[PDB]
Amino acid sequence: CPAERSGHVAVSDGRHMFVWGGYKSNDFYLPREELWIYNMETGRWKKINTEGDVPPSMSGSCAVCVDRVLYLFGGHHSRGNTNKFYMLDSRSRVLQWERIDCQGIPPSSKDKLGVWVYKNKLIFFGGYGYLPEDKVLGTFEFDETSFWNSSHPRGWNDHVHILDTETFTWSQPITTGKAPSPRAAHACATVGNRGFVFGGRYRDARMNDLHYLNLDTWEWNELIPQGICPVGRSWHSLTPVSSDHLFLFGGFTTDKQPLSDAWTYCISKNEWIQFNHPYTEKPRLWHTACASDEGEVIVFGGCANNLLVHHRAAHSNEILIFSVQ
């Protein structure tokens, strides 16, 4: 079984779930060369060692699986944040990582962000990291705590960047509407041409807001569901489960309460529906969640308590299976 961890990545093609990186206590990053594969249909794990341009071991990286080609951006290693971009073709032989020297201006070095996949584009939003090298489209807000306990200050951004896989070129779309505030540890989910984003941390709050960016027109929209909404949080997962539902699980509140609540956001109804499940005693923060082809949401890793208290952090290696559809 894979070692416990938080801040790893997990991506899938609906049947196989690829898990990489992250860190644990007793702190250290998990081995960079390992790639763990969970077969969603059988519940078994397989460890494969990779070669090539292996990325440094990181937490907070942002990854996707498109046609069984994995792509990884950003993260935080022993020497801080990065804006490097890697590809790992998993289709067919020893897997080889490829660090892509992209054209255009990359996003600033950062972690704890989100991404939407839409046709040939990978669209990245937000995150936490260094001051961008130059003034680009969007806003950056420093985290005042980063100036006293560090040699290099950091902050949040609301930046939207496209990595076009036709040419491996970075760009920023000109957006209309009001973008969500700069944030990190938010969660992104895509359904068709709508790139949803929920929650996240900004300044002294872990937020409860929900927006979508139209990935064809580049117009931002704020969603105002009526009635009861989930509590504000960061470090939660948001996973599309059908053409009309997003599944929300776990996270951490503004007042540092670990969460075990689950909800479905019904897009057509613009309404949140609380989801009953057998894991109320299993809150998770910084876990990952992948949808299977069987309607399930497979949650892995993450921490059961306040991982900000590193010596008491309860990092997990459990798989929690939510039967959503």
């Binding site: 801040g7 935080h76 801080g80 972690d111 704890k112 936490y128 950091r154 951490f252 590193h310």
Partner: peptide, 7 residues
């Protein structure tokens, strides 16, 4: 640690 900041 530096890895958990900003969350």
């Amino acid at each position: 640690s530096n890895n958990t900041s900003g969350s």
